[PDB]
Amino acid sequence: NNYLTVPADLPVITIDPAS
Amino acid sequence: KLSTTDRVVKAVPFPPSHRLTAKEVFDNDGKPRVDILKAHLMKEGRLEESVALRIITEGASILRQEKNLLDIDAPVTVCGDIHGQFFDLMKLFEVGGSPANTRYLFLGDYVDRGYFSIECVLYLWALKILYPKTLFLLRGNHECRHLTEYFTFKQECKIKYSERVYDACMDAFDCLPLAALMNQQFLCVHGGLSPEINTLDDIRKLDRFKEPPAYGPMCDILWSDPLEDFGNEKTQEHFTHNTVRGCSYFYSYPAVCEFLQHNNLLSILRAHEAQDAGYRMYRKSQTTGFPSLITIFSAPNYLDVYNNKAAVLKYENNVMNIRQFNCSPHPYWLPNFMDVFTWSLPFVGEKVTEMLVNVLN
Amino acid sequence: MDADEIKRLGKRFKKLDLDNSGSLSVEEFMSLPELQQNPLVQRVIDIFDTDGNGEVDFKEFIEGVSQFSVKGDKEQKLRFAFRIYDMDKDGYISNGELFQVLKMMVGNNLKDTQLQQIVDKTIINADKDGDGRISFEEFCAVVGGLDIHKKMVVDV
Ligand SMILES: [Ca+2]
Ligand SMILES: [Ca+2]
Ligand SMILES: [Ca+2]
Ligand SMILES: [Ca+2]
Ligand SMILES: [Fe+3]
Ligand code: NA
Ligand SMILES: [Zn+2]
């Protein structure tokens, strides 16, 4: 190892996708 | 040559060392100054212990006076697991709307896994103090002593605050309501249904002011899941042992539909299981034409590896509006809050010794 | 130290002193293939180079190797490790040098932003007298219980 490593009526349904 | 004293990566702001006092966190009328708190906590700033304890115990006192089963009218924004992802909670309020003018319901699992759990608790508890009748908090299965000592929340408290603050959180978590009846249409819980819960009155009769037991209705509310094959049941049993959790049960689609019809409900809103999109709409009930179950999950890029979206559900004007959001940057911590000396010294001793052995042959 | 050890170190010093100048340069250390990929070589050389002239003379060589003796105590070993981080040799580990030395060890396994963040937090949490830097006493409070001194032993 040469480098240090890190240890281990009816409601409608709508969609607003991610910005 | 780079300075050996001044900081190398100057674009990173040095976190504040000062701990906020009571006058800095509570205004003239005793209301939390959540703008001050938000800005300070986003910088990884800490509070004085007495001030953290005041937030926790004042929030607990509000929760302590609430019912097991909250009665929450629409409109409301419903939110799932947070798991200590404070910088994603900040984005969540941007997407859902300011608590100054937005009603909120959180379904639990505020702590563990993410390394900003105490900041999540302090900020949400401050908001509950400031907005006692428009922001609501339910208990998740991680809001207990059993899981927070196994995962990292207890250690996080001891690094940033004290075990006294951890103990205060545990007593506060005991006050968290277990369920919400939302707009007289939705039962909202962290996990789900229970073989011992056939009516909403069965929830009202529970004693919630305790560590969640290893079995029983309070356990099941916090811990249960839909079957893996929910809606496609060969599995004719309504409740079966939940082999994923090691406690509580899987509930079937017939189980959910029967509960909904008997209690005149439209759907169960819950969290507790990560979703790639931040939500899942389950099979419609044949008698309602509406999804029988909805999972909401508000922790984006869960565990820094899932790469999932988060979502919240804004229910308003007879519209169920799913709002997704992506993860946001957060400051780095080594696993288990390890410091860089503990992390690097084994490697230093290994490599300096290796050099010497080779130099000497 | 032991007489036969002094004799062996003389012979090894001469073999490393490629240009027979009486002092070991960085290039001469780096001529050893297994040192070329060890990211702390320059730090160890700097510690051995107590007079700061950039090279290791024989006196420096012997005193440097002596710190890795079986007879050395815990404080002696831990103080060598401390000096790995304390680039400027003022007796305190400061932010800039802690980042630089960790950056040598980790390379690209962490981004500069992430490394600066955990360096900041270690400085804050480990600084107990408020001067903003880590003394040997503060250093040992954190790592003293890890028993790394047991591994820093070399047979001459
Ligand atoms: Ca030479
Ligand atoms: Ca020299
Ligand atoms: Ca120094
Ligand atoms: Ca100090
Ligand atoms: Fe969870
Ligand atoms: Na405790
Ligand atoms: Zn859960």
Side-chain angles (χ1 to χ4, degrees), chain A, chain B residues 2-22 24-204 206-233 235-361, chain C residues 1-70 72-149 151-156:
Chain A
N1 55 320
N2 291 342
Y3 290 102
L4 177 59
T5 61
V6 182
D9 182 10
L10 211 60
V12 175
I13 307 164
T14 66
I15 309 300
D16 294 338
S19 303
Chain B
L2 289 172
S3 174
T4 57
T5 55
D6 294 326
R7 298 169 67 254
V8 172
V9 189
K10 295 188 191 301
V12 174
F14 191 64
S17 301
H18 53 275
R19 292 187 176 259
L20 293 185
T21 67
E24 286 156 1
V25 169
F26 294 91
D27 73 9
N28 303 16
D29 298 324
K31 300 178 176 161
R33 308 169 71 189
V34 292
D35 292 348
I36 296 299
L37 193 62
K38 169 162 68 175
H40 189 67
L41 296 176
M42 285 193 299
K43 296 172 174 75
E44 295 175 291
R46 298 161 300 182
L47 314 182
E48 286 195 341
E49 173 160 308
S50 65
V51 178
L53 290 169
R54 174 166 171 194
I55 289 172
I56 295 161
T57 60
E58 287 192 6
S61 301
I62 294 167
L63 297 169
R64 182 174 290 111
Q65 308 296 299
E66 293 183 317
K67 292 138 67 112
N68 287 359
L69 177 66
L70 306 175
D71 183 70
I72 305 176
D73 291 334
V76 68
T77 299
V78 185
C79 313
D81 300 29
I82 300 305
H83 280 306
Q85 299 180 203
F86 182 75
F87 294 83
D88 298 311
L89 183 63
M90 299 302 92
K91 182 67 178 182
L92 177 155
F93 286 117
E94 179 176 352
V95 170
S98 175
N101 46 62
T102 309
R103 301 158 55 80
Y104 272 97
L105 171 63
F106 289 80
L107 301 181
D109 275 10
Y110 313 108
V111 301
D112 287 334
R113 304 233 175 73
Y115 285 7
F116 311 98
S117 292
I118 191 58
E119 291 84 358
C120 290
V121 168
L122 291 170
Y123 190 65
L124 286 170
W125 260 241
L127 288 171
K128 181 60 169 171
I129 296 166
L130 186 62
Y131 303 114
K133 292 301 181 181
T134 61
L135 182 135
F136 300 95
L137 304 171
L138 303 185
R139 199 175 197 169
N141 58 306
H142 279 258
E143 276 74 54
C144 72
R145 298 155 182 87
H146 186 36
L147 267 54
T148 55
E149 76 195 8
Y150 180 73
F151 294 94
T152 59
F153 180 55
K154 181 176 174 180
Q155 176 183 2
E156 184 185 333
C157 288
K158 291 177 70 65
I159 293 290
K160 303 177 177 176
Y161 286 91
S162 72
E163 186 154 347
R164 186 170 303 92
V165 169
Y166 170 78
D167 289 340
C169 291
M170 295 299 104
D171 293 320
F173 286 172
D174 291 344
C175 301
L176 280 163
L178 305 174
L181 174 63
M182 195 269 281
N183 207 58
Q184 303 277 108
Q185 295 175 299
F186 303 103
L187 172 61
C188 311
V189 294
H190 181 70
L193 296 181
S194 176
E196 313 189 50
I197 294 170
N198 303 119
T199 66
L200 296 177
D201 261 355
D202 289 328
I203 298 174
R204 305 192 175 97
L206 300 173
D207 173 23
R208 78 179 194 264
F209 297 96
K210 63 159 87 172
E211 174 80 1
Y215 70 96
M218 183 176 167
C219 172
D220 297 335
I221 290 173
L222 306 179
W223 277 95
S224 64
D225 295 301
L227 285 166
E228 173 70 29
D229 290 351
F230 187 92
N232 301 126
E233 276 84 9
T235 317
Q236 284 148 24
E237 281 194 297
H238 278 203
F239 294 91
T240 49
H241 293 104
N242 188 317
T243 54
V244 175
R245 305 298 183 174
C247 68
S248 190
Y249 304 91
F250 299 117
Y251 43 91
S252 74
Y253 167 82
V256 171
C257 290
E258 178 167 309
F259 181 91
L260 294 175
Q261 181 67 19
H262 182 49
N263 290 284
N264 205 66
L265 300 169
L266 188 57
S267 187
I268 304 300
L269 305 183
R270 50 88 70 168
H272 192 44
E273 292 181 295
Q275 307 296 321
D276 287 334
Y279 67 95
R280 185 172 157 181
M281 304 281 169
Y282 298 75
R283 187 177 164 194
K284 298 177 167 177
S285 170
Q286 290 156 305
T287 168
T288 65
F290 199 79
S292 61
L293 188 69
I294 300 179
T295 294
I296 188 66
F297 193 77
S298 304
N301 193 31
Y302 185 49
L303 301 184
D304 295 324
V305 297
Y306 270 60
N307 205 32
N308 62 293
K309 301 290 186 285
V312 301
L313 311 186
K314 179 158 280 206
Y315 187 54
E316 179 166 18
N317 296 322
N318 207 33
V319 172
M320 175 161 289
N321 176 222
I322 317 301
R323 301 185 175 191
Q324 302 175 281
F325 56 107
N326 273 323
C327 71
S328 304
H330 63 78
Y332 186 70
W333 270 104
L334 286 170
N336 297 120
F337 303 91
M338 180 179 278
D339 65 274
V340 297
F341 295 124
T342 301
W343 174 43
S344 62
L345 182 58
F347 182 85
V348 170
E350 165 176 320
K351 288 291 168 182
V352 300
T353 300
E354 199 174 319
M355 164 175 183
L356 267 284
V357 169
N358 296 126
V359 166
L360 295 172
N361 255 17
Chain C
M1 53 163 63
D2 203 322
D4 64 331
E5 293 173 340
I6 299 170
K7 215 199 188 186
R8 281 198 293 279
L9 292 170
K11 299 185 186 173
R12 187 63 185 163
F13 185 92
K14 289 183 174 58
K15 190 168 184 179
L16 302 171
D17 184 15
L18 292 179
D19 69 356
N20 194 31
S21 64
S23 291
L24 301 181
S25 68
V26 177
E27 283 192 88
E28 284 170 349
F29 280 102
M30 297 299 181
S31 297
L32 304 183
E34 45 269 313
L35 269 58
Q36 299 166 345
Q37 296 183 130
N38 183 328
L40 292 178
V41 170
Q42 184 60 67
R43 291 301 314 130
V44 171
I45 296 176
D46 190 52
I47 296 172
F48 279 32
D49 177 19
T50 41
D51 68 9
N53 73 334
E55 299 199 347
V56 180
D57 61 54
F58 185 71
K59 185 161 60 162
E60 293 170 335
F61 187 71
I62 292 291
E63 320 214 48
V65 173
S66 300
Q67 284 148 166
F68 293 84
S69 175
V70 303
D73 65 353
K74 186 176 75 182
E75 181 183 3
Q76 188 188 68
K77 314 290 186 181
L78 287 180
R79 195 175 285 276
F80 191 88
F82 180 84
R83 293 183 162 120
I84 291 291
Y85 302 95
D86 184 24
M87 291 180 69
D88 54 21
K89 305 196 187 189
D90 66 352
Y92 303 95
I93 301 169
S94 294
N95 197 306
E97 54 193 2
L98 181 51
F99 178 98
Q100 292 181 235
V101 173
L102 287 168
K103 185 69 182 303
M104 297 175 196
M105 299 184 250
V106 304
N108 292 316
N109 291 339
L110 279 179
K111 295 139 62 175
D112 284 2
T113 289
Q114 302 173 299
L115 183 62
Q116 181 68 75
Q117 286 165 344
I118 55 177
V119 167
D120 285 346
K121 289 196 267 285
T122 292
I123 294 286
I124 292 168
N125 289 330
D127 186 24
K128 299 304 182 192
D129 56 11
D131 66 352
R133 57 199 179 168
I134 302 304
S135 67
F136 180 66
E137 290 74 27
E138 291 162 338
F139 175 75
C140 297
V142 178
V143 306
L146 300 184
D147 294 335
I148 302 302
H149 65 278
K151 318 296 278 286
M152 301 170 64
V153 170
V154 183
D155 284 331
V156 184

